């Protein structure tokens, strides 16, 4: 059993070890961001990539290093080298780029950032599983903000209830 990289979503210099399951938006909400208060001039850092995983919705995106991706034997590693080459070409462009042009690039990154956050929001629930957990939660088939119905996903009911109870109540309405 192996995970597959679908898309590289972002890159950062982050606190060493601020990667994997503790960096999901829902781990962060429950326990705090592992990268909280990281100032790259006051502590050791490492290059981390935000990964959208094949077959997992955007709420499950995690930060990873080249090291953790290789240790976990993830598929889609050709995408890493591509992303690095793309990012190297952008840095180069920025280094010899107008203030105006650099200005428009930075607005585009903010809008993209905003769009990516929408993908982690359940817009509505459209099915539920017959089977419940021992704690009585079904799983829910979720339609995500800003994504087509093809990108709906089954999600753990206990998890979805923490933040999207109103969607649950609308669905059973």
């Amino acid at each position: 059993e192996f995970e597959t990289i679908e898309r590289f979503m972002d890159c950062r210099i982050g606190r060493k070890g601020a990667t994997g399951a503790t960096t999901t938006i829902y781990a962060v909400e429950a326990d705090g961001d592992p990268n909280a208060g990281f100032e790259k001039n006051k502590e050791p850092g490492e290059i981390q990539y935000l990964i959208k995983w094949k077959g997992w919705s955007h709420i499950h995106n995690t930060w990873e290093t080249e090291e953790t991706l290789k240790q976990q034997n993830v598929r889609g590693m050709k995408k890493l080298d591509n992303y690095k080459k793309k990012d190297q070409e952008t840095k180069r462009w920025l280094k010899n780029a107008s203030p105006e042009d650099v200005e428009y690039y930075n607005c585009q990154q903010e809008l993209t950032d905003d769009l990516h956050k929408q993908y982690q929001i359940v817009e509505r629930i459209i099915a539920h599983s017959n089977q419940k957990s021992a704690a009585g939660y079904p799983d829910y088939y979720c339609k995500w903000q800003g994504l087509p119905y093809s990108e709906c996903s089954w999600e753990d009911g206990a998890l979805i209830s923490k933040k999207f109870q109103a969607c649950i109540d609308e669905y059973f309405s």
């Binding site: 994997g20 399951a21 829902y26 499950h60 089977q131 799983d139 089954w154 999600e155 753990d156």
Partner: peptide, 7 residues
């Protein structure tokens, strides 16, 4: 069961 979470 298609639903999972990151552990």
């Amino acid at each position: 069961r298609t639903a999972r979470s990151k552990v």
